């Protein structure tokens, strides 16, 4: 995207498991079926 | 998006499990079927 | 969106489980079926 | 995207497991089915 | 993309496992089915 | 891409395993099915 | 691409293993099926 | 590419193993199926 | 390519093993199926 | 290529093993299937 | 190619083993299947 | 090639073994299947 | 080729073994299957 | 070739073994299958 | 070739063994299968 | 060839053994299978 | 050939052995299978 | 040949053994299978 | 040949052994299988 | 031959042994199988 | 869908223009945020 | 859906324009926010 | 989809223009955010 | 899909233009963000 | 896909133009972000 | 795919132009970001 | 693929032009970022 | 592939031009970034 | 591949031009970044 | 390949031009960056 | 390859021109960057 | 290769020109950068 | 190769010209940069 | 090679010209840069 | 080679010209840079 | 070689010209740069 | 060689001209640069 | 050589001219630069 | 040599000219630059 | 030599001219530059 992202960690006293999945999905811009510049 | 995101952690005294799934879904912009610039 | 988001953690004394799913769903912008610039 | 990203670590006292999957999905720009510059 | 990225490490007191996967997916630019410069 | 990337390491008190895989997927530029400069 | 990359190491107190795989995938420029300069 | 790259090492107190693989994949330039300068 | 590359070493207190493989893959320039200067 | 390369060593306190394999793969220039200067 | 290369050594306190293999692969110039200067 | 190459040694305190192989592979110039100066 | 090469030695405190094999491979100029100056 | 070469030695405190093999491979000029000055 | 070569020695404190083999391979000029000055 | 060569010695404190084998290989000029001045 | 050669000796403090085998190989000029001044 | 050669000696403090063999090989001029001045 | 040769000696402090073998090999001029001044 | 040759001695301090074998080999002029001044 | 579709044309006495766009929209199956097979 | 669709044309005596956009909208199946198989 | 489609043409007495765009939109199967086989 | 498609043409009395674009859009199978076989 | 396709032509009394683009879009199988066989 | 395709032509009374492009887009099989056989 | 293809021609009364481009796009099999057989 | 292909011609009354390009694109098998047989 | 191909011609009443290019693109087998048989 | 190929001609009433280019592109078999039989 | 090929001609009533270029491209077997039988 | 080839001619009523080139390109077997039997 | 080849001619009513060039290119066997039987 | 070859002629009613050039290119066996039977 | 060859002629009604060139290229056996039977 | 060859003639009704050139090229056996039976 | 050869003539109704040149080229056995029976 | 040869004549109705040249070139046995029975 | 040769004549109805030149070239046995039975 | 030779004549009807030149060339045995039975 036209902007950024961020993340942060820091400590813990025991075991830690982390799973991260960002932005699942097709589109982030524009989807166009058909465009016509001009007819007659 | 034209804006950013953020996250934060910090500590804990025992085991921690974390699962993250951001922005599930197709679109973040525009979907359009068809456009006509001008007819007759 | 044109606005950001945030999250926070902090500690606990025992095991903690977290599951997060943000913005489930297709659209965040505009959906258009058909547009006509002008006829006759 | 026209913007960057970031990440952060820092220490912990025991074992840590991390799994990261950035931007899963087809499109980040524009998809066009068919475009016509002009007809008659 | 038109912008860069970043990452960060730092130490820990015990074993750490890290798995990283950036930008899984087909497109980061523009996909065009067919384009016509002009007809009659 | 038209921009660079970065990474960072630093020490740790015990064993560390790291696996890195950037930019999985076909396209980073433009894919065009067919283009016509002009017809009649 | 039109831009460079970077990496960083630094020390550690015990054994470290690193595996690096950069830019897996076919395309980094332009792929064209067929282009026509002009017809009639 | 049209830009350079970089890497960095530095020391360590115990054994280190490194495996590196840059730019796996077919294309870094342009692939054209068929191009026509002009027809009739 | 139209630009250079770089690498760096430096010392270590114990044994180090390094394996390096740069730019694995067929193409770094242009591939053309067939090209026509002009027809009729 | 149209640009140069570089490498660096420096000392170490114990045994070091290095294996280097640059630019694996067929092409670094242009591959043409068939080209026609002109037809009728 | 149209540009040179470089390498560097320097000392070490214990044994060192080095294996080097530059530019494995067929082509560094141009490969043409068939070219036609002109037909009718 | 149309440019030169270089290498460097320097001392060491214990034994050193070096194996060096330059430009393994068939081509450094141009390979042509067949060329036609002109037909009818 | 149209350019020269270089190498360098310098001393060492213990035994050194060196093996050098430059430019292994068939071609360094031009290979042509068949050429026709002109037909009809 | 159309250019020259070079090498360098210098001293050493213990035994040294060197093996040198320059320009392995058949061709350094031009190989032609068959050439025709002109037909009809 | 159309250019000369060079070599250099200099002293050493202990024994040295040297083996040198230059330009192994058939051709340094031009190889032609068959040439025709002109046909009909 | 159309250019000369060179070599250099200089002293040494202990025994030295040298073996020199220049230009192993058949051809330094031109090899022609069959040449035709003209046919009909 | 059309050019000369050179060599150099100079002293040494202990025994030295030298072996010199210059230009091993059949051809230094031109080899022709068959040449025809002209046919019909 | 069409050019001369050279060699150089100079003294030595201990025994020296030299073996020299110049231009081993059949041809230094032109070898032709057969020639035809003209046919019909 | 059409040019001369040269050699050089000078003194020595201890025993010296020299063996010289110049231009071993059959041909130094031209060898012709058969030649025809003209046929019909 | 068409040119001369040369050699040099000079004083020596201890025993010296020299062996010279100049231009061993069959041909120094021209060898022809058969010549025909003209046929029919 | 688990069912097919259909279309029909037939004639007209003058010019006819038709534009068709089937099934505008993201989904035809199922979109779900998250599932849990079982907890404690 | 589990049902098919249909369309029909037939003729008219003058110009006719038709624009058709079927099933505009995201969902045709089922959308689920979160589902739990069972807790305690 | 698990079912097929169809289309039909037939004749007309004058010019006809037809534009067709089937199934614009991301999904025809299943999209899953995250699934868990079982926890504790 | 698990089913086929179809199309039909047939003749007309004057010029006809047809443009066809089937199945524009990313997905036709299954997209999964992350799946877990089992945890504790 | 697991099924085939079809097309049909047939004649027409005047000029006809046809443009066909089948299955534009990234995916036709399955895309998985990350899958885990089992954890603890 | 696991199934074949088809096409059909047949005649026409005047000129016909046809342009055909099949299966535009990256994937026809399976794309996986990262897979884990099992952890602890 | 695991299945074949087909095409058909047949005659026409006037000129016909055909352009065919099948299966444009990177993948027809499987693409994997990283796979792990098993960890601890 | 694991299956064959086909094509068909047949006659025509006037000139015909055909251009055919099969299977443009990188992959027809499997592309793998990195695989691990097993770790600890 | 593991299967064959085919083609067909047949006659025509006037001139015909044909241009054919099969399987343009890098890969028909397997491309692997790196493989590990086993670690610890 | 592991299967054969085929082609067919047959007659024609007027001139015919044919150009054929099979299997353009680098690879038919297997390309491997680096393989490891086993580590510790 | 492990299989053969074929071709066919047959007659024609007027002039015919044919140009054939089989299997343009580097590889038909296996290309290995570097392989290791085993380490420690 | 491990299999043979074939070709066929047959007659024709007027002039025919044929130009044929098989297997243009470097490799038909195996190319290996470097192989190691075993290390420690 | 490990198999044979074949060709065929047969008659023609007017003039015929044929040009044949089989297996143009460097390698038909195995090319190895460097091989090691075993190290320590 | 380990196999033979073949060719065939047969008659013709008018003039015929044939040119044959088999197996252009350097290698038909094995090329090795350097081989080591064993080290320490 | 380790196998024989063959050729065939037969008659013709008018003039015939034949030019034949077998196996142009340096190597039909083994070319080795350097071999080492064993080191320490 | 380790096998024989063959040729065939037979009659003809008008003039015939034949030119035959077998095995042009340097090597039919083995070429070795330098071989060592054993070192220390 | 270790095998024989053959040739054949037979009659002809008009004039015939034949030119034969067998095995042009330097080597039919083994060429060795330098061999060592054993060192220390 | 270690094997014999053969030739054949037979009659002819009109004039015949034959020119024959066997085994042009230097070597039919073994050529050795320098050989050493043993050193220290 | 170690084997014999052969030839054959037979009659002829008109004039016949024959020219025979066997084994032009220097060597049929062994050529050695210099050989050493043993050193120290 | 160690074997004999042979030739054959037989009757002729008209004038016949024969020219024979057997085994032209320097060597039929062994040529040695210099041989040493033993040193020190």
mmCIF file of N, CA, C and O in Angstrom, chain H residues 8-37:
data_model
loop_
_atom_site.group_PDB
_atom_site.id
_atom_site.type_symbol
_atom_site.label_atom_id
_atom_site.label_comp_id
_atom_site.label_asym_id
_atom_site.label_seq_id
_atom_site.Cartn_x
_atom_site.Cartn_y
_atom_site.Cartn_z
ATOM 1 N N UNK H 8 27.891 -8.711 4.005
ATOM 2 C CA UNK H 8 28.739 -8.407 5.151
ATOM 3 C C UNK H 8 28.873 -9.651 6.019
ATOM 4 O O UNK H 8 27.953 -10.466 6.123
ATOM 5 N N UNK H 9 30.043 -9.780 6.642
ATOM 6 C CA UNK H 9 30.367 -10.921 7.478
ATOM 7 C C UNK H 9 30.537 -10.575 8.944
ATOM 8 O O UNK H 9 29.559 -10.486 9.693
ATOM 9 N N UNK H 10 31.795 -10.395 9.355
ATOM 10 C CA UNK H 10 32.182 -10.132 10.739
ATOM 11 C C UNK H 10 32.312 -11.432 11.525
ATOM 12 O O UNK H 10 31.907 -12.498 11.049
ATOM 13 N N UNK H 11 32.873 -11.349 12.729
ATOM 14 C CA UNK H 11 33.367 -12.530 13.418
ATOM 15 C C UNK H 11 32.262 -13.244 14.187
ATOM 16 O O UNK H 11 31.084 -12.899 14.107
ATOM 17 N N UNK H 12 32.672 -14.286 14.910
ATOM 18 C CA UNK H 12 31.793 -15.061 15.777
ATOM 19 C C UNK H 12 32.676 -15.882 16.709
ATOM 20 O O UNK H 12 33.844 -16.143 16.411
ATOM 21 N N UNK H 13 32.120 -16.275 17.857
ATOM 22 C CA UNK H 13 32.897 -16.991 18.860
ATOM 23 C C UNK H 13 32.918 -18.499 18.647
ATOM 24 O O UNK H 13 33.879 -19.153 19.068
ATOM 25 N N UNK H 14 31.892 -19.065 18.015
ATOM 26 C CA UNK H 14 31.845 -20.497 17.762
ATOM 27 C C UNK H 14 31.555 -20.715 16.282
ATOM 28 O O UNK H 14 31.509 -19.770 15.491
ATOM 29 N N UNK H 15 31.360 -21.981 15.915
ATOM 30 C CA UNK H 15 31.218 -22.347 14.513
ATOM 31 C C UNK H 15 30.014 -21.659 13.881
ATOM 32 O O UNK H 15 28.993 -21.433 14.532
ATOM 33 N N UNK H 16 30.149 -21.317 12.601
ATOM 34 C CA UNK H 16 29.063 -20.728 11.829
ATOM 35 C C UNK H 16 28.987 -21.423 10.479
ATOM 36 O O UNK H 16 30.019 -21.688 9.857
ATOM 37 N N UNK H 17 27.768 -21.716 10.035
ATOM 38 C CA UNK H 17 27.515 -22.285 8.718
ATOM 39 C C UNK H 17 26.600 -21.341 7.951
ATOM 40 O O UNK H 17 25.625 -20.829 8.510
ATOM 41 N N UNK H 18 26.916 -21.111 6.679
ATOM 42 C CA UNK H 18 26.168 -20.182 5.841
ATOM 43 C C UNK H 18 25.947 -20.824 4.479
ATOM 44 O O UNK H 18 26.870 -21.415 3.909
ATOM 45 N N UNK H 19 24.724 -20.707 3.965
ATOM 46 C CA UNK H 19 24.380 -21.152 2.619
ATOM 47 C C UNK H 19 23.619 -20.025 1.940
ATOM 48 O O UNK H 19 22.639 -19.515 2.493
ATOM 49 N N UNK H 20 24.064 -19.640 0.747
ATOM 50 C CA UNK H 20 23.551 -18.459 0.066
ATOM 51 C C UNK H 20 23.192 -18.814 -1.369
ATOM 52 O O UNK H 20 23.918 -19.567 -2.025
ATOM 53 N N UNK H 21 22.075 -18.268 -1.853
ATOM 54 C CA UNK H 21 21.582 -18.512 -3.211
ATOM 55 C C UNK H 21 20.871 -17.250 -3.693
ATOM 56 O O UNK H 21 19.784 -16.918 -3.212
ATOM 57 N N UNK H 22 21.484 -16.552 -4.647
ATOM 58 C CA UNK H 22 20.917 -15.308 -5.150
ATOM 59 C C UNK H 22 20.153 -15.535 -6.448
ATOM 60 O O UNK H 22 20.613 -16.259 -7.336
ATOM 61 N N UNK H 23 18.984 -14.901 -6.552
ATOM 62 C CA UNK H 23 18.253 -14.773 -7.807
ATOM 63 C C UNK H 23 18.135 -16.144 -8.463
ATOM 64 O O UNK H 23 18.860 -16.454 -9.413
ATOM 65 N N UNK H 24 17.308 -17.013 -7.891
ATOM 66 C CA UNK H 24 16.896 -18.253 -8.536
ATOM 67 C C UNK H 24 15.655 -17.945 -9.360
ATOM 68 O O UNK H 24 14.728 -17.286 -8.874
ATOM 69 N N UNK H 25 15.641 -18.407 -10.606
ATOM 70 C CA UNK H 25 14.573 -18.087 -11.527
ATOM 71 C C UNK H 25 15.083 -17.676 -12.896
ATOM 72 O O UNK H 25 16.222 -17.240 -13.078
ATOM 73 N N UNK H 26 14.199 -17.818 -13.881
ATOM 74 C CA UNK H 26 14.568 -17.663 -15.283
ATOM 75 C C UNK H 26 14.956 -16.237 -15.659
ATOM 76 O O UNK H 26 16.094 -15.987 -16.068
ATOM 77 N N UNK H 27 14.026 -15.296 -15.520
ATOM 78 C CA UNK H 27 14.131 -14.030 -16.232
ATOM 79 C C UNK H 27 14.552 -12.883 -15.326
ATOM 80 O O UNK H 27 14.091 -12.762 -14.188
ATOM 81 N N UNK H 28 15.442 -12.038 -15.851
ATOM 82 C CA UNK H 28 15.713 -10.726 -15.283
ATOM 83 C C UNK H 28 15.560 -9.597 -16.291
ATOM 84 O O UNK H 28 15.737 -8.434 -15.912
ATOM 85 N N UNK H 29 15.247 -9.896 -17.550
ATOM 86 C CA UNK H 29 15.055 -8.875 -18.561
ATOM 87 C C UNK H 29 13.681 -8.940 -19.196
ATOM 88 O O UNK H 29 12.668 -8.883 -18.493
ATOM 89 N N UNK H 30 13.629 -9.065 -20.521
ATOM 90 C CA UNK H 30 12.371 -9.058 -21.253
ATOM 91 C C UNK H 30 12.232 -10.337 -22.063
ATOM 92 O O UNK H 30 13.196 -10.799 -22.679
ATOM 93 N N UNK H 31 11.026 -10.900 -22.057
ATOM 94 C CA UNK H 31 10.688 -12.082 -22.842
ATOM 95 C C UNK H 31 9.537 -11.717 -23.767
ATOM 96 O O UNK H 31 8.491 -11.246 -23.306
ATOM 97 N N UNK H 32 9.728 -11.939 -25.065
ATOM 98 C CA UNK H 32 8.732 -11.608 -26.078
ATOM 99 C C UNK H 32 8.395 -12.880 -26.840
ATOM 100 O O UNK H 32 9.298 -13.588 -27.301
ATOM 101 N N UNK H 33 7.104 -13.168 -26.972
ATOM 102 C CA UNK H 33 6.660 -14.310 -27.746
ATOM 103 C C UNK H 33 6.802 -14.076 -29.235
ATOM 104 O O UNK H 33 7.484 -14.835 -29.929
ATOM 105 N N UNK H 34 6.155 -13.026 -29.736
ATOM 106 C CA UNK H 34 6.262 -12.654 -31.138
ATOM 107 C C UNK H 34 5.980 -11.166 -31.273
ATOM 108 O O UNK H 34 5.064 -10.634 -30.641
ATOM 109 N N UNK H 35 6.775 -10.500 -32.107
ATOM 110 C CA UNK H 35 6.639 -9.068 -32.337
ATOM 111 C C UNK H 35 6.561 -8.817 -33.833
ATOM 112 O O UNK H 35 7.290 -9.443 -34.607
ATOM 113 N N UNK H 36 5.680 -7.904 -34.234
ATOM 114 C CA UNK H 36 5.467 -7.566 -35.637
ATOM 115 C C UNK H 36 5.705 -6.072 -35.801
ATOM 116 O O UNK H 36 5.133 -5.262 -35.062
ATOM 117 N N UNK H 37 6.548 -5.709 -36.770
ATOM 118 C CA UNK H 37 6.816 -4.304 -37.016
ATOM 119 C C UNK H 37 5.684 -3.597 -37.733
ATOM 120 O O UNK H 37 5.471 -2.398 -37.531
#
